[PDB]
Amino acid sequence: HKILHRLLQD
Amino acid sequence: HKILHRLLQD
Amino acid sequence: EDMPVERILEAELAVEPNDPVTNICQAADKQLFTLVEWAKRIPHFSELPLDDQVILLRAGWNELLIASFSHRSIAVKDGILLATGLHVHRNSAHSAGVGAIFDRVLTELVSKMRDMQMDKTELGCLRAIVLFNPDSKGLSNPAEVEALREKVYASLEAYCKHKYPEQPGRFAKLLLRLPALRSIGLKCLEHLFFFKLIGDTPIDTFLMEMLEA
Amino acid sequence: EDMPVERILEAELAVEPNDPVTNICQAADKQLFTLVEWAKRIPHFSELPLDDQVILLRAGWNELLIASFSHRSIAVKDGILLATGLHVHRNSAHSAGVGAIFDRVLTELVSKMRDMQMDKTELGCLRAIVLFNPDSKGLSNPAEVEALREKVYASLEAYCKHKYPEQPGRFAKLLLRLPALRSIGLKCLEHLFFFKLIGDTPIDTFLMEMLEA
Ligand SMILES: CC(C)(C)c1ccc(O)c(C(C)(C)C)c1
Ligand SMILES: CC(C)(C)c1ccc(O)c(C(C)(C)C)c1
Q1: Quick check: D66 and D182 in contact, CB under 8 A?
Q2: Which chain A residue's Cα is nearest to D38?
């Protein structure tokens, strides 16, 4: 799940 | 809804 | 005095009792008759107009029986005790193509009931909250059904606080099993509509009627 | 203390902003970005393992967005105010073939939120309860999630007793919208899958991602 992971980092 | 109406009535 | 937990518990006690899908269906048709009798023993339900009684039972039956099979199964290791006295084990459910939904019942309902030691009064109150569902479509008087529900849950909270004074959270915890119940209930309905559609499961008359629109 | 309602409120205030289905899907995709931002401001959410954060949001996003759109719409008669400054009226939803689900949102959520004047704190808390779903498949530590849920509802309850001492059943009444939300959520989701399956509606990337295995 690319986008969710990215947005959760910063 | 025959059966429900009959059970509820008596 | 308006909605006494002693009366709700007596309703519960008053109705105490080869394909796994087939057994669950047979038990459910049987239990629907007992469900009507239980409903009549719930304070003020029979004061409601006949059509509202019909609406509430048609809206709630799936959940009401699921709650009931779940709680009755708290001493069963990995399965469900049916009203018949038959057990269905999760292996059987899996082997029948209904593994995941069955597991959801075990994990989200049975286990949670077992861990918190939900008692028959709490169950009865939860089932009566389900019964008095003010969102059911076509109710002559939604507000009166919401008011009865409020009386059930006020009486439930007072009971939990008195009987379990060490567990301030118990009441909210009980109520927070209702979303799981709604979801599992809906998903069990979908399964049943599929069994009826494809026609490889005998469905007895009362269960069929509850499945009509 | 550990789950301060003022922080939950702050989370809510921090993210404050043709085809009705298209607009809805468009508004949901944009709001999914802000939901992630919302969740990070829920006490202890960012301290969970990254996979559990992913699981809780994948399990909750549709309920959480429905909760927001519904509460945002308490000031309008028969429509929803989407995040982006667009409204969807009942009629327009009916005209697009999603009248039944939409009416459920109006009748079981928006109207009931309005009648009780649910405030932003209570909404936030309900949302955090939905977010901290310990039934979500695959959680590394379900019990920690249940604990966080418990802390949220303890805080919500105290808050309701302090701010609404007049209304001893308000806490329960709040929690008793959760089943309808669960139900409406599941329905909106099935609709969405159908829209994607049919290819009748553009679906943006983050919404698309949420609908993937
Ligand atoms: C697992 C359990 C026995 C609770 C169950 C399974 C499937 C199912 O369809 C139902 C109904 C009540 C909808 C009949 C119950
Ligand atoms: C009516 C409302 C705007 C709450 C809504 C309708 C349909 C729908 O699919 C969704 C999602 C959030 C699942 C996208 C929301």
Answers
A1: no
A2: A8
